[PDB]
């Protein structure tokens, strides 16, 4: 059973360095090359460089020369990737992949990935705000309401409605990173306006990192 296992996710301050590992097994480590790619949040893949486990010979991408440093440890079958002077732009997923080369070239096995969040922020619970129309209107058939989960760190937060009793029509958007370095997302739900008053709607936001649990009754 061949596989490449990478080290866990990491949060780093700008200017610091991170060193991700890629442990190889189920095959002869030295027979295949190890490449390192990276993928930012809303972007495609990008190649960092490769390294020959059987010699330590490397090849880098011009944009990562000096910054990125690839190494290996044949006694533990582990490949390393160290990025220095980290900036917010370095925030992305880091992959390591092997490249079979015996009878042909094939980058077949990939590591699970290692998220590197380059942030200067600190764990902060969010502030849950109610999302409701200025004035309740009977004109429309369905009404929409939600909860704005603002200023929090890190990810994620789990929003639910009526403790799981209301699931249909719910839409929890993906968090957005604010210039403050803090996350903010909104959860919304469409319901029959012909029950907006006698029926209570409440969102249950949960942010484990800060042990915050908030329930906010919406209009």
């Amino acid at each position: 059973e061949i596989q490449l296992v990478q080290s866990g996710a990491e949060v780093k301050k700008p200017g610091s360095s991170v060193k991700v590992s890629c442990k190889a097994s189920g095959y002869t480590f030295t027979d295949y090359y190890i490449n390192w790619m990276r993928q930012a949040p809303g972007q495609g893949l990008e190649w960092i460089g490769w390294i020959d486990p059987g010699s330590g010979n490397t090849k880098y991408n011009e944009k990562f020369k000096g910054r990125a440093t690839l190494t290996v440890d044949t006694s533990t079958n582990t490949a390393y990737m160290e990025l220095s002077s980290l900036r917010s732009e370095d925030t992305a997923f880091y992959f390591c992949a092997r490249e079979k080369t015996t009878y042909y070239y094939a980058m077949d096995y990939w590591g699970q990935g290692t998220l590197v969040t380059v942030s200067s922020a600190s764990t902060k619970g969010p502030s849950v705000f109610p999302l409701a129309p200025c004035s309740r209107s009977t004109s429309e058939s369905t009404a929409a309401l939600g909860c704005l989960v603002k200023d929090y760190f890190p990810e994620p937060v789990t929003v639910s409605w009526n403790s799981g009793a209301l699931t249909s029509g719910v839409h929890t958007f993906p968090a957005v990173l604010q210039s403050s370095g803090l996350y903010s997302l909104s959860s919304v739900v469409t319901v029959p306006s012909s029950s907006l008053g006698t029926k209570t709607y409440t969102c249950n936001v949960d942010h484990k990192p800060s042990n915050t649990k908030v329930d906010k009754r919406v209009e």
């Binding site: 790619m37 190649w47 090849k59 999302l131 603002k150 957005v176």
Partner: protein, 219 residues
């Protein structure tokens, strides 16, 4: 340095269709040994890339036989004969002929369905938030298709730009639609000095761009 471009960026297709993805290299990827140094990768959100085609047309081990590839010199193409639900993902092509290795922009294969205009809703900032210095206005675009949509914020009939952030949900697994959340951020002071807050949504399902709004002190 070889440039790899993929077209189209997004591709709407339905289960059972024969989908073809194209990749284009700035120069011939044919090697002296007769082989074409090209990789085809599949990637699902939050997951690591999976190898599909090695050396342009060679199907990778484990990959389903509905996948096939071809191409000559500079134009390559991946084909999925009878699209299965498991085939909705993003496909990237990569060149491993020269250094550095380069990928394509990637092409997303989403579920094709009928057009659907977005139900728009605009929420004003809560009292609690204004009681904290900041004010954020939210505009919702519920269940629509296709993904393409322009949200234009107008404060006292004055176009805003660079003070709002959008967020889109992943395609719905039941009705195949999308939802978007635009969040306009202002200071309590700036909010306090303006009356009308509008949200102009431009979409294909709408013959004319709909404009949902609210007057400041009227809720």
């Amino acid at each position: 340095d070889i440039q790899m471009t993929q077209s189209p960026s997004t591709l709407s297709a339905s289960v059972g269709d024969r989908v073809t993805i194209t990749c284009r290299s700035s120069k011939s990827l044919l090697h002296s040994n007769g082989d074409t140094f090209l990789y085809w990768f599949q990637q699902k959100p939050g997951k690591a890339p999976k190898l599909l085609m090695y050396r342009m047309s060679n199907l990778a081990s484990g990959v389903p036989s509905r996948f096939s590839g071809s191409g000559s010199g500079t134009e390559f193409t991946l084909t999925i004969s009878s699209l299965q639900p498991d085939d909705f993902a993003t496909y990237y092509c990569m060149q491993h002929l020269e250094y550095p290795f380069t990928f394509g922009q990637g092409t997303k294969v989403e579920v094709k369905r009928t057009v659907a205009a977005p139900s728009v809703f605009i929420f004003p900032p809560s009292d609690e938030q204004l009681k904290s210095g900041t004010a954020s206005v939210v505009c919702l675009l519920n269940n629509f298709y296709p993904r393409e949509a322009k949200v234009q914020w107008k404060v006292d009939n004055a176009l805003q730009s660079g003070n709002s952030q959008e967020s889109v949900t992943e395609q719905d697994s039941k009705d195949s639609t999308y939802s978007l959340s635009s969040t306009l951020t202002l200071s309590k002071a700036d909010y306090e000095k303006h009356k009308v807050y509008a949200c102009e949504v431009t979409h294909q399902g709408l013959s004319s761009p709909v404009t949902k709004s609210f007057n400041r002190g009227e809720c």
